Structure formats: structure tokens, C-alpha cells
Design a protein around this ligand. Structure first.
Ligand SMILES: Nc1ncnc2c1ncn2[C@@H]1O[C@H](COP(=O)(O)OP(=O)(O)NP(=O)(O)O)[C@@H](O)[C@H]1O
Ligand SMILES: Nc1ncnc2c1ncn2[C@@H]1O[C@H](COP(=O)(O)OP(=O)(O)NP(=O)(O)O)[C@@H](O)[C@H]1O
Lengths: 270, 270
């Protein structure tokens, strides 16, 4: 049933003659958050391609290839595309890169320079390899989602980009591999991130207009509780353009560290 | 027979049922040099698309007269979108960023041009989804930029270079030629003549590359030209040339009055 394909030539050979394709790009180490992407994908096309590739160009990491394909076989995945580095980067350098706008240096990008350029570039390469009709990305990595929506529009990729809802724990914590780094005490404290975002969201829903004050209060509550806050920001939904007074479709985003571990989350408000 | 299509949506609808597509992107004002491209494309696919498009992101005759020259050549589609069709927000947020080549040779005198070319060609590639794309060797640096992005971004497109069509006096055909004065047009073939003389020195074992570049520039300057550059580079990649090299290209750009002219000669040493 399911095929494991490692070369661009074999992937293209398989994809021709096939109809609609839904595509889920990942870096492996698959968990429940990823399966949400896969399940939504399978609701949109009979042929689901999942890519597993770790990208030297977006790092600042485990493999477990055998376990990954087993989790996906159960979910009706047609093809797992897992090329090696040289397959995608046959020369050392990547000479032609997809260059994001200034968004790449904001929010998470301020402490991950080059990261979103690397994401945009490898996703463009993957789009040109798989030629998908639909591609699923999770709302938890909102800035990544905006960059991928932006490159899709600006480069005329004929691909429907499908945001997939953030899976959360029972206590509200957004599911992420990063959670495994948290000590027992930190994991009990970790749900405060989502709680503060929701409180910002309620203030906005209740006519609150002081964006900067709301961000600071959320940051102050996190800091006082032991977090090291990277940012809390209110921006326009989908595009992450600056939030303007009177905007009705907004998103609150935050990134903050408990010890050595950085957590991110966000809440959309309408 | 031949269609003029102005929207991305109608181009995609026409292309969906068609098999192999060969693509010739242009800025219009067509002349016999462009027809050379069209003839090569027509040798490689039953369906030839010619695009006519200009924009303030890469500039760094009427459409009907252009379409008449192409109907005679077996062109299936003339794709002529307006600026807003391809750049609906005016600003291009996500650009295909070339390496340092984009600032060498002509890019030294055309800031932003090769970024804009690389970007608009990627967009047209994602719109037309061609199997074959033809480009002229007269714009040698452009050809290398397009081969580089095709490889680095895994566009599944065969890039076919086409030899420079010339006037009887050797002058490389170009839309810019119509702006030349009477005297300037009579002087313009000296550019190609000096490039051939440089190529002749190289075929005869000449190793003083820097001296050859200077002599041609000085002679063109002495003849009334304003020389941007004369350079000996490695063929195809345009890497800097080294003394033993056997596959070389001599490139020049120079101005007669208001009109900037470029040309090149490839050399293959035994
Ligand atoms: N809680 C979540 N809900 C839905 N999708 C998620 C969630 N967490 C992560 N993702 C998806 O994870 C993809 C990124 O791949 P990958 O980095 O392999 O997973 P990850 O958990 O986000 N890594 P990280 O969170 O940075 O440790 C994104 O495109 C999202 O679609
Ligand atoms: N004389 C020529 N011989 C072969 N190909 C050519 C020639 N002139 C242009 N082309 C190619 O035609 C395509 C479209 O080039 P384009 O810029 O539209 O024409 P152009 O003559 O260079 N106009 P301009 O540079 O503004 O004077 C490119 O792939 C060029 O390399």
C-alpha cells in the first residue's frame, strides 16, 4: 500500500498519472500533532504525500525513520518522501534562496536568523518536487504559516494552503515535541502560556484598545511566574501585519522560555 | 488557432488539458532574434507559449503587432497579463534571491535586475508549468541565473539555450537597436568584432586575460563608446576565468550615446 520514496526521480514518476495530492511536510519524529495534519490531508485527497526531511538551512535532532512510517501507514498515507541531504542539496551551498520580507527578522525570527529563509526555500523546493494540490501546515507555527502563505501567493504556486488546528493537552498546553524537555514542575507551570493568551483575547473581545498594555501585562505575569519572555505581540490575523487601532481580525502570539526550553503559542480573535 | 490569454486562471485552464509545453518568456517588441527562440521551442513541443510581460521589478510596439509575428510561427498561446495580474499588491514580498552573480557583470550596472528576473521567471514557471523553456545566449548572465534557479529550486523544466541571432554586420539583434542614431548603428558592430578578436587571441594560446579585457575596453573607449565591462569568464557558470581554462566566454557591455549594448563570444580551447 504505502511507498517509501527517496529520490526526486522516483517521486515524480509516482506523482504523474496520480490525481489530486495533499502534501504534509515534516522533519520526522512524528507525533500526534503531525497526525492532525495527516488526517486533514486525507480528508482532502485520496493520495497523501508526507515528506520527512531535516533541513540544514533552517537549524540554528533525532531520526527514528522506522517508527515514523509505521505511525503514518495507519493513517492512510500513500507516499513517505524521505530524501537524503545530497538529494535536495547536491552542491554544498544553496545559491538561489526564497527571500522573505522583513517578517523573517520579527517575532521568532529575531532569535532565529536565516530560519524562515530556509523554511521558504526548502518548502519551495518541496512544492516543485511533489507538485501538490493541497498542503497542510499547523496553526501553532503561525509565523511559518504566514511565510508559506506569502510565498505561495507571491510566487504563484497553484497550491491550496490548509491551516490545521493546534492540538492541545487537557490543561490547554499546545502539543509539541518541545514539551518533552520540560521537567515535571515546568510541565505543571507550562499551561500559563495559553492562559495568558486567552486573557489577552478576552480583553480584545471586550473592546480593549490598549494593545501595548495588554502585551505587557501578559509578559509581566509570565516573568513574575518564572518565565523568560521573548515576546508577546498582537498582530493582524493570517498575515502578521502590524495590528492597527480598530482591527477586528487579530492574533496574539507569544514565545517564552521555562529554563532552557522555548515554548510558543497563539490565539486568534474575531 | 493562436490564442491571446491575459489571466492566470485562463492560462491554467488552457494548460491543464494540453500535453507537453515549450515556453518562451519575453518583454515584447519582438524581432527575428525572438523568433529563433520560438522556432527552437516549436521543435520540442506541439504547444508553444510565448509570454509578453514588463514590470518595474526587473527593468532595473503594440501587442497586436507582436501577436501577428507569432501567429505565423505556430504559437499556441500568447500570455499577456497586466502588471496587476502578476503583482496584485505591487510590492513583491517573496523574491528569488540569486547569489553574488547578481551583482557582477551587468548586475553591477543594473541593481535589482537579476533578482527581479529570477523572481518573475519563477512566477511564470509556476503559472505556465512548462516542460521546456528557451532563453537567448546573448543574455548570458540571465541564462546562468535561470539555469541556477531551475536547479536550486527543483523546477522540473528543461532549459534550452538558443544562439544569438545577428544582423548581417554581426550586430546582435535587440529591441534597443531601434534607438541607435545613424552614426551609432554604423559603429555598433565594433563591439562584436573586438569580442571575436579577444576570442581569437585565446584560441591562439593567449594567457594575459586581464590585458585582453583592457585592450578591448580601451579601443572601444577610444572609438567613442562608454564601456561598462569586458570580461573573460568560464563558460556556463560565469565563474572567474583561470589561466589554463579551455571553456571560456568573453562578455562585454558598452554604451553608444544613450543605448546600452551587450554581446558575448564563447571559446572552446583544445
Ligand atoms: N499542536 C500542534 N497542532 C497541529 N500541528 C502542529 C502542532 N505542533 C506542531 N504542528 C505541526 O508541526 C509542523 C512542523 O514540523 P515539526 O517541526 O516536525 O513538528 P513540531 O512539533 O512543530 N517541531 P517543534 O514544535 O518546533 O519542536 C508544523 O507545520 C505544524 O503543522
Ligand atoms: N538576438 C537574440 N538572439 C537570441 N535570443 C535573443 C536575442 N535577443 C533577445 N533574445 C532572447 O529573447 C528573450 C527575451 O528577451 P527580451 O529582453 O524580451 O528581448 P531584448 O531584445 O533583450 N529586449 P531589450 O533587452 O529591452 O532590448 C530572452 O531569452 C533573450 O535572451
Amino acid at each position: 500500500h504505502m511507498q517509501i520514496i527517496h529520490t526526486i526521480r522516483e517521486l515524480r514518476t509516482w506523482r504523474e498519472n496520480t490525481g489530486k495530492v495533499a502534501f504534509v511536510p515534516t522533519m520526522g519524529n512524528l507525533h500526534e500533532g503531525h497526525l492532525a495534519l495527516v488526517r486533514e490531508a486525507r480528508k482532502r485527497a485520496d493520495n497523501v504525500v508526507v515528506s520527512i526531511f531535516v533541513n540544514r538551512l533552517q537549524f540554528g535532532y533525532p531520526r527514528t525513520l522506522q517508527q515514523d512510517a509505521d505511525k503514518l501507514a495507519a493513517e492512510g498515507v500513500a507516499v513517505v518522501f524521505a530524501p537524503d541531504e545530497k538529494e535536495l542539496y547536491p552542491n554544498v551551498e544553496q545559491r538561489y534562496n526564497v527571500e522573505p520580507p522583513h517578517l523573517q527578522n520579527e517575532l521568532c525570527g529575531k532569535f532565529r536568523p536565516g530560519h524562515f529563509r530556509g523554511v521558504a526555500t526548502v518548502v519551495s523546493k518541496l512544492f516543485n518536487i511533489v507538485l501538490p494540490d493541497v498542503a497542510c501546515f499547523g496553526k501553532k507555527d503561525y509565523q511559518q504559516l504566514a511565510v508559506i502563505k506569502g510565498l505561495t501567493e507571491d510566487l504563484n504556486f497553484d497550491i491550496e494552503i490548509v491551516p490545521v488546528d493546534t492540538g492541545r493537552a487537557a490543561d490547554g498546553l499546545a502539543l509539541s515535541s518541545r514539551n518533552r524537555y520540560l521537567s515535571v514542575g515546568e510541565r505543571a507551570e507550562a499551561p500559563r502560556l495559553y492562559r495568558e493568551l486567552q486573557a489577552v483575547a478576552e480583553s480584545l473581545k471586550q473592546g480593549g484598545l490598549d494593545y501595548a498594555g495588554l502585551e505587557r501585562q501578559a509578559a509581566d505575569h509570565l516573568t513574575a511566574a518564572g518565565w523568560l519572555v521573548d515576546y508577546v505581540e498582537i498582530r493582524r490575523a493570517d498575515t502578521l501585519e502590524m495590528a492597527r487601532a480598530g482591527d477586528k481580525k487579530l492574533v496574539v502570539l507569544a514565545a517564552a522560555r521555562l529554563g532552557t526550553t522555548r515554548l510558543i503559542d497563539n490565539v486568534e480573535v474575531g
